[PDB]
Curated annotation (Swiss-Prot), chain B:
Cytoplasmic-side segments: 1-298
Covalent cross-link (Glycyl lysine isopeptide (Lys-Gly) (interchain with G-Cter in ubiquitin)), residues: 5, 83
Catalytic activity: TSAVLQ-|-SGFRK-NH2 and SGVTFQ-|-GKFKK the two peptides corresponding to the two self-cleavage sites of the SARS 3C-like proteinase are the two most reactive peptide substrates. The enzyme exhibits a strong preference for substrates containing Gln at P1 position and Leu at P2 position
Function: Cleaves the C-terminus of replicase polyprotein at 11 sites. Recognizes substrates containing the core sequence [ILMVF]-Q-|-[SGACN]. Cleaves and inactivates human TRMT1, preventing tRNA guanine(26)-dimethylation of tRNAs. May cleave human NLRP1 in lung epithelial cells, thereby activating the NLRP1 inflammasome pathway. May cleave human GSDMD, triggering alternative GSDME-mediated epithelial cell death upon activation of the NLRP1 inflammasome, which may enhance the release interleukins 1B, 6, 16 and 18. Also able to bind an ADP-ribose-1''-phosphate (ADRP).
Official protein name in the record: 3C-like proteinase nsp5
Active-site residue list: 41, 138
Mutagenesis or variant effect for residue 138 to A: Complete loss of 3C-like proteinase nsp5 cleavage
Residue ranges occupied by any Peptidase C30 domain in the UniProt entry: 1-298
Regulation of this protein's activity per its record: Inhibited by pyridone-containing alpha-ketoamides compounds 13a and 13b. In turn, alpha-ketoamide 13b (tert-butyl (1-((S)-1-(((S)-4-(benzylamino)-3,4-dioxo-1-((S)-2-oxopyrrolidin-3-yl)butan-2-yl)amino)-3-cyclopropyl-1-oxopropan-2-yl)-2-oxo-1,2-dihydropyridin-3-yl)carbamate) inhibits SARS-CoV-2 replication in human lung cells. Inhibited ex vivo by michael acceptor inhibitor N3. Inhibited ex vivo by compound 11a and 11b.
Subunit structure, as described in the record: 3CL-PRO exists as monomer and homodimer. Only the homodimer shows catalytic activity. Interacts with host FBXO22; this interaction promotes the proteasomal degradation of nsp5.
Compartments where located: Host cytoplasm; Host Golgi apparatus; Host nucleus
Naturally occurring in which organism (per UniProt): Severe acute respiratory syndrome coronavirus 2
Amino acid sequence: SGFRKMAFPSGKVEGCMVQVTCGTTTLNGLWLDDVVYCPRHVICTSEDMLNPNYEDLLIRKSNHNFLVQAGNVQLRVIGHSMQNCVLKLKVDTANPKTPKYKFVRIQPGQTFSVLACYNGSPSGVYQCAMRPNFTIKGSFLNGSCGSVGFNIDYDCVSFCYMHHMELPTGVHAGTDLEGNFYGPFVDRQTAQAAGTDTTITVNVLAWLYAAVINGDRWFLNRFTTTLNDFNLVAMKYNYEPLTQDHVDILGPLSAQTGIAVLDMCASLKELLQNGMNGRTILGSALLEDEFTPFDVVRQCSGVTF
Amino acid sequence: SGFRKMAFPSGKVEGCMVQVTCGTTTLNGLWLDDVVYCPRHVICPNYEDLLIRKSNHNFLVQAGNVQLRVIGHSMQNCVLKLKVDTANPKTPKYKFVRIQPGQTFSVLACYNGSPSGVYQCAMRPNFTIKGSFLNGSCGSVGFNIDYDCVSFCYMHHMELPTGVHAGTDLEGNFYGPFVDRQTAQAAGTDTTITVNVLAWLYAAVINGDRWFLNRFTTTLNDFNLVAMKYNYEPLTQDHVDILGPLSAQTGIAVLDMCASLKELLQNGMNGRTILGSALLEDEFTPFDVVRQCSGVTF
Ligand SMILES: COCCN(C)S(=O)(=O)N1Cc2ccc(Cl)cc2[C@H](C(=O)Nc2cncc3ccccc23)C1
Ligand SMILES: COCCN(C)S(=O)(=O)N1Cc2ccc(Cl)cc2[C@H](C(=O)Nc2cncc3ccccc23)C1
Ligand SMILES: [Cl-]
């Protein structure tokens, strides 16, 4: 019993964190085999950030301009290349602590663990989700750039995010490990803002199914709904549209609890209309949207209470 | 910017988790040097009588894909100490510390000696923890990290009927009036950790959430009279002193913030949130707020 925002154990990722320094800029890098991956803005000054020409800035650099530090050991850079918004620094030593890994690009609504780092040293781990507006509500200070997001289903680390910047609303933007940004963002200091965000509907439904598994049913009702009528109501509360894929994905949780997806959609509609009336659901007074159907199946018991 | 429920990096603890099997019971153990620590209920009620009937070879200890050999055993309070023939090469610098209610720690939840997740939690005033544990999680540990040293403070033993959890320090002394057996046990009435709610209100002000700030202040006695009405723990002069740094950084005196908390307790949030929450959060200590809003590393 219980339901917590749970992160993956971070050890496999901690053994990959390094410090990358270029001139006056210091940030984090991810050392996998003989390559250190880091944001390409490590080659920029603050002035350069308005309209940086990364290709022109990079051609002026040599291997020995990049200082890479792994713990108390200085790694030697023997090559460099840029792939989209990430810099790949070839080093002369392979990381002996390299785990089994993959680079995966995720979709909005997906969750992942973030190992926040400063000066190549891990400070904390937390769980978060890729928002529908492609930002993440992280906890990052100056020097956190290069910190990574990951999942560890089984013994393989799937790296899905690398931190690049903080937007004016305090939310965060970054890339996959191939250097492609999530969202319409650029690694440039522009009048750049997060679009209006929405609630991840399929995740709120998963979390309501989690509450039923843990023994709480106060929010259920005798009604059902069509998918179209649910979406017409949901969009009035800034909730993401629920697709047939989302309904299919919730199938297992529907079979375990005995509550049809469209019946759970009816309960959600009523919660949006009424509020909680002094009650909580899994210790929360708001509808939680940062647990996926997969996270609920992984954390909750296989036997409903 | 941002404020998350943040756990310590778990790697130094992951390298200590092992699986312990005795008969039909399988649970987790903590392997430090040549000793594996685990709940004594793995042998399950006279515990010394149950233990005297066991030999070293009855305990099967598995570290990854390697079977460790048990060469001795002893009991210390509610913790079983299994002497093994191999010292853990991954043993970090560590200490066993007993924490107080209100203090927070990270939990590395494990099943079959394999870490599955890490989360942050607090020792409630009623000595329980609101954790996330299923069958097989016994032996999972709670810890904090100070520089390069792991301070182990909790070992999981059981789930109470309300779904909350109970356990011991690493010397086997329970937190709370609990016993390690199947009997009528219940968590006492819980209270809110006042000094922690205040720390979280300072974290909100630091992050640019000031709507609850007001021109008023209060005495410590008047604040405590109000706080007792809402099942909040009393605020002591030690708590006021501990909040000193956050008070100097934001310019809001601790009794100035107490007047804000009193108004929130008497009138609610009125449709508003603080750091994305509609409830007053009490599982961040003043030290957690300072650490997360400064970037301390390990
Ligand atoms: C203070 O607002 C943050 C943005 N800045 C105006 S800045 O610090 O000068 N800035 C500009 C900028 C522009 C583009 C890119 Cl790709 C990166 C960056 C940097 C950036 O975003 N770094 C940070 C990342 N995460 C978290 C932070 C938290 C605090 C402070 C920097 C944080 C630096
Ligand atoms: C209905 O929940 C209580 C479960 N038990 C009644 S039990 O499974 O029979 N039970 C009895 C018991 C008595 C004393 C001690 Cl020290 C430990 C234990 C065990 C216990 O508490 N183990 C669990 C720990 N954390 C989480 C759980 C979650 C589910 C199920 C066991 C969980 C087992
Ligand atoms: Cl995805």
